[PDB]
Design a protein around this ligand. Structure first.
Ligand SMILES: O=P(O)(O)O[C@@H]1[C@H](O)[C@H](O)[C@@H](OP(=O)(O)O)[C@H](OP(=O)(O)O)[C@H]1O
Length: 107
């Protein structure tokens, strides 16, 4: 659970906090996926962390003009987009995030 499943640089923006909409502010983030949370740093203490238990993950093609976007909405209501210009690495992230989120459903 504390172990790192994936880490890498992605572009990210918050879009809601506790169910309230936020102005986007896209920027690069060093992103760390553990066995139960996604952790954001300015570079390789976290700026922020979210628990992924019960998170809703989807494609975010409808939520941005950017290419290769994922949308995550957490149980407390925080919502984020992740994006990369590199479609294969974005797909790798999508699969890793799916794996961790689904794992929290059964364990
Ligand atoms: O800075 P502002 O004036 O608030 O303008 C937003 C800005 O251009 C964001 O880049 C854009 O999101 P994308 O780059 O992800 O397309 C967003 O679109 P949206 O409101 O349709 O999310 C605009 O509202």
């Amino acid at each position: 659970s504390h172990e790192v499943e994936k880490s890498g640089l992605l572009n990210m923006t918050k879009i809601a906090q506790g169910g309230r909409k936020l102005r986007k502010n896209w920027g690069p983030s060093w992103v760390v996926l553990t066995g139960n949370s996604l952790v954001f740093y300015r570079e390789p203490r976290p700026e922020s962390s979210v628990d992924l238990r019960g998170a809703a993950l989807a494609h975010g093609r409808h939520l941005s003009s950017r290419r290769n976007v994922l949308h995550i909405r957490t149980i407390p209501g925080h919502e984020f987009l992740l994006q990369s210009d590199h479609e294969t690495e974005l797909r790798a992230w999508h699969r890793a995030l799916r794996t961790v989120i689904e794992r929290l459903v059964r364990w």
